């Protein structure tokens, strides 16, 4: 009974401290938004950002290679599991490389250094419908009413509320919904076109719902801000497009289902790749290893493999290594306690900087060891934490 009371108390404390942390994030976001919006006029922004079809140039017989690639002007739809090309234009920091474009190891060295200097980032923003606006408003108001009742019922958590506010005011550094983060380490490119893959699940492992998605590109330059301050960015958003899961439509069209016939299994991949979705050969290779007695391929297993993350990444988590992937929740918790109140947008903007700082400079506070960590909160206190040790 005492343990249950302690657990309830800890849950109430967590709720009240989160409620106290909520306004700091909003005020910091407002301040950094003001600092950002007062900056683009002085700097040079990106004038145009467009999304085009992925180039699959396989030159036929009699076709020379020096011909420039052909790309579509625009696309009104982004399939949930397809590839895309984004085109932008920027200032002199890349026209210098455009000059230097016109066979030596040191030449490639200096070209690579100039490539390293640049920095780009791509994100996706979903427009929120009014129904979702009011649906989230009612949920958040219910939660804050519940936390108010929690504060009322026990005349002790008011002190913790004020202490949390003071601690956040002493720790915090002084200064339309994010959907998924695309390639973050994208650098300045010769052709100003970047290839991106949209994953089925976002950073939090949930599918992306129906909505109008806008591609927002933010450009960084290390010459001005070497600390990667989120305020100093060149921000440009493209026109909204529709995103949906084309897999049910494609499978229904192809099959006119639970077991894909073995004979017609292979043409289905060609149909998918014609429709625009990309299916790795490894994915199909090990999808064909789980067939039934007759040879039919399990459609649900193939779909799970296709939407899985091991075979193909989103070019953002691909840059992150397995160690960073393992310690990412710890970095998330430390980031949200250092900056009281945060969300996916700011976490994605500061994603790789903090991870590289943690896994390069510190490398020891994170990267849990074998004797100071607990791998199961219900087993660590008994098995791994014997009272002798």
């Amino acid at each position: 009974r005492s343990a249950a009371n302690l657990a309830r108390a800890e849950d109430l404390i967590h709720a009240v401290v989160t409620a106290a942390a909520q306004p700091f994030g909003e005020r910091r976001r407002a301040a950094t938004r003001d600092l950002h919006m007062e900056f683009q006029r002085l700097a040079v922004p990106v004038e145009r950002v467009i999304v085009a079809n992925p180039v699959s140039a396989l030159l036929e017989s009699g076709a020379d290679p020096d011909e420039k690639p052909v790309e579509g002007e625009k696309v009104n739809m982004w399939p949930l599991g397809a590839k895309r090309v984004v085109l932008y234009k920027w200032s002199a920091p890349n026209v210098e490389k455009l000059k230097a474009m016109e066979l030596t190891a040191k030449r490639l060295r200096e070209i690579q250094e100039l490539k390293r200097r640049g920095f780009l980032e791509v994100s996706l923003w979903r427009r929120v419908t009014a129904q979702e606006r009011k649906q989230r408003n009612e949920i958040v108001e219910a939660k804050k009413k519940q936390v108010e009742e929690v504060v009322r019922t026990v005349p002790s958590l008011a002190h913790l509320h004020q202490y949390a506010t003071s601690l956040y005011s002493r720790i915090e550094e002084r200064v339309w919904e994010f959907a998924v983060l695309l390639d973050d380490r994208v650098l300045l490119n010769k052709e100003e076109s970047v290839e991106l893959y949209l994953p089925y699940r976002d950073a939090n492992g949930e599918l992306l719902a129906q909505g109008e998605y806008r591609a927002l590109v933010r450009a960084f330059d290390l010459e001005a801000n070497p600390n990667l301050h989120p305020a100093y960015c060149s921000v440009g958003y493209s026109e909204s497009f529709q995103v949906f899961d084309a897999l049910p439509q494609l499978i229904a069209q192809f099959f006119r289902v639970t077991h894909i016939p073995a004979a017609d299994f292979t043409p289905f991949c060609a149909f998918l790749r014609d429709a625009g979705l990309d299916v790795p050969l490894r994915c199909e290779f090990e999808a064909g290893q789980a067939v039934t007695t007759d040879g039919d391929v399990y459609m649900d297993y193939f779909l799970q493999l296709l939407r899985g993350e091991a075979f193909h990444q989103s070019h953002a988590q691909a840059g992150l290594t397995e160690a960073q992937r393992a310690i990412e929740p710890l970095c998330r918790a430390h980031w949200v306690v250092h900056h009281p109140g945060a969300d996916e947008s700011e976490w994605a903007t500061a994603r790789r900087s903090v991870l590289d700082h943690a896994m390069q400079h510190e490398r020891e506070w994170w990267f849990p060891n074998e004797m100071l960590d607990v791998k199961d909160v219900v087993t660590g206190s008994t098995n791994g934490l014997t009272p002798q040790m």
């Binding site: 005349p155 002790s156 002190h159 913790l160 004020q162 003071s166 002493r170």
Partner: peptide, 29 residues
């Protein structure tokens, strides 16, 4: 310890009657 409110600061140190009195005064005010 140092950044904590005085109620928490003195409740971590075993003084419980003083902590209760301070909490009562604070909830009164």
């Amino acid at each position: 310890h140092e950044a904590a409110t005085p109620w928490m600061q003195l409740v971590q140190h075993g003084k419980k009657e003083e902590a209760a009195a301070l909490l009562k005064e604070f909830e009164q005010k």
